[PDB]
Ligand binder design. Structure first.
Ligand code: VFD
Ligand code: OLC
Ligand code: OLC
Ligand code: OLC
Ligand code: OLA
Ligand code: OLA
Ligand code: OLA
Length: 407
């Protein structure tokens, strides 16, 4: 007897019609749908409870269900005439109006691309070249290297390739933003380069974790080169890319171009099943926090504080303090650079999830989330500019200062 419940009754009876053999089954399902549509018509949308009954938005709201009942009656006519297949075809027209509802009222849409800043496209390209240069230096340095590479370098290389490949998609999103969320590259490049981003970004976050584990292993076990298993890197590297691949599978199944009518543009969005669009957006958002921040941060944090106590356990010399503090400074940078770059995006992601769940119905809050999302998304890309400084460039100084305190 609620708007959310009235739409579940409708989309559930839509399925009954699609799998039916006689017109009596269709007639029965359509009868329930007509009652739900009329009842839903008497349900103010929760996100705009403030708006008065006669506001033009509540006029278009109740009107959407008049179009719906009109289609439900046209199908009932065919079903009463024993035209089961004709009625089923008419029910396809209902999914078209149901799609119009979830865009207009369900989610962020009820509160436009006309919040466009010229800065974002400028900033996105700035990070692109800056990141592509520092990361093309990381890989090229390996050519000029003069020493024995530890398994750590394997993670440095894979971290840079992922950073380069995800940074390589920044021009797509800068142009996508400059054209007010109107995808021009085609429907295949939205599903492809949309998942390709999520793929390399999970890989980037998963390899950052491998680095924090390896460095924690380096402090607790000084003889780690011999202590290692030669095959471990041969197993860990494939495993990371596969975990990143599995983590981005939802993007590949759903990421596709869909036409936003009221905006008149072709957007590259997550095309969830409309009958469960809110539940997926909330669920997928929460898996972004867990797999992409919570679980990762549990490793970096544990590895850091595990390094911190070990260094505090060895000695207390006044000079060795300098060598041990520089290691703590370098271990404290990866953990801080990760939360500074990623905590903004994931907080907004969690809040957006609380919106799809119905907790945050404030439009002023949802507007702030939408206005701050492109900047938070940029800090995520920025950690790809900070990774070269955190590992590669300070990689020679890390190994040396452990061999000093382990003399
Ligand atoms: C056609 O668009 C887009 C398709 C797919 C994606 C995005 C996108 O939006 C991009 C966009 C930017 C600017 C303007 C318009 C769009 C952005 C982002 C997201 O969930 O929302 N995303 C990501 O994998 C995340 C992410 C989060 C957790 C763990 C791994 C990856 C991401 C966040 C921040 C920085 C990089 C990656 C895929
Ligand atoms: C963000 C919320 C949770 C993710 C991070 C959870 C924080 C994990 C803390 C791990 C930790 O504190 O390490 C334990 C101990 O200090 C080691 O010796
Ligand atoms: C933008 C800045 C806002 C800051 C918000 C950060 C959000 C992440 C929260 C915690 C991650 C770190 C976990 C901290 C847990 C402390 C563990 C600890 O203190 O361990 C002591 C050690 O064991 C001695 O014996
Ligand atoms: C290896 C371990 C990996 C762990 C894997 C992480 C996956 C995410 C886990 C839990 C989130 C569950 C979210 C599902 C619930 C979605 C919200 C919902 O259904 O409710 C919507 C709302 O009620 C309508 O108004
Ligand atoms: C703007 C880019 C976002 C911030 C990037 C790097 C800052 C974090 C690096 C570590 C800061 C201090 C480290 C320390 O002294 O322990
Ligand atoms: C970045 C900050 C992250 C905050 C931690 C939140 C972690 C959430 C983890 C699992 C979500 C649990 C289930 C989600 C709510 C149940 C669905 C519902 O209530 O309808
Ligand atoms: C380009 C955007 C900024 C990139 C890097 C700046 C942050 C470098 C911080 C180094 C911390 C010092 C240390 O690790 O000991």
């Amino acid at each position: 007897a609620d708007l959310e419940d009235n739409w579940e009754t409708l989309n559930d009876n839509l399925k009954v019609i699609e799998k039916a053999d006689n017109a009596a089954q269709v007639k029965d399902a359509l009868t329930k749908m007509r009652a739900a549509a009329l009842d839903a018509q008497k349900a103010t949308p929760p996100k705009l409870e403030d708006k008065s009954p006669d506001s033009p938005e509540m006029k278009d709201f109740r009107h959407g269900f008049d179009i719906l009942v009109g289609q439900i009656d046209d199908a009932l006519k065919l079903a009463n005439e024993g035209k089961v297949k004709e009625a089923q075809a008419a029910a396809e027209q209902l999914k078209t109006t149901r799609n119009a509802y979830i865009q207009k009222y369900l989610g962020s849409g009820s509160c436009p691309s006309d919040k466009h800043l010229d800065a974002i496209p400028i900033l996105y390209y700035i990070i692109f070249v800056i990141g592509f240069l520092v990361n093309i230096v990381v890989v090229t340095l390996f050519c000029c290297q003069k020493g024995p590479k530890k398994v750590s370098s394997i993670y440095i290389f894979n971290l840079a390739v992922a950073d380069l490949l995800l940074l390589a998609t920044l021009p797509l999103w800068a142009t996508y933003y400059s054209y007010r969320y109107d995808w021009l590259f085609g429907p295949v490049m939205c599903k492809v380069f949309g998942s390709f981003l999520t793929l390399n970004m999970f890989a980037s976050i998963f390899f950052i974790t491998c680095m924090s584990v390896d460095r924690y292993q380096s402090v607790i076990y000084p003889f780690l080169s011999q202590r290692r298993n030669p095959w471990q890197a041969s197993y860990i590297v494939p495993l990371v890319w596969c975990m990143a691949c599995l983590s981005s599978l939802p993007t590949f199944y759903f990421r596709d171009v869909r036409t936003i009518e009221y905006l008149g543009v072709n957007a590259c969005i997550m095309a969830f099943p409309p009958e469960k669009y809110a539940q997926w957006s909330a669920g997928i958002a929460l898996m972004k926090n867990i797999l992409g921040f919570i679980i990762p941060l549990i490793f970096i944090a544990t590895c850091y504080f595990g390094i911190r106590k070990h260094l505090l356990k060895t000695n207390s010399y006044g000079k060795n303090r300098i060598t041990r503090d520089q290691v703590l400074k370098m271990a404290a940078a990866v953990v801080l650079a990760f939360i500074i770059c990623w905590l903004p995006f994931h907080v907004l992601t969690f809040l957006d999830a609380l919106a799809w769940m119905g907790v945050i119905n404030s439009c002023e809050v949802i507007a702030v989330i939408d206005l701050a999302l492109p900047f938070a998304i940029l800090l995520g890309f920025t950690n790809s500019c900070v990774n070269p400084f955190l590992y590669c460039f300070v990689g020679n100084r890390f190994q040396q200062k452990l061999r000093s305190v382990f003399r």
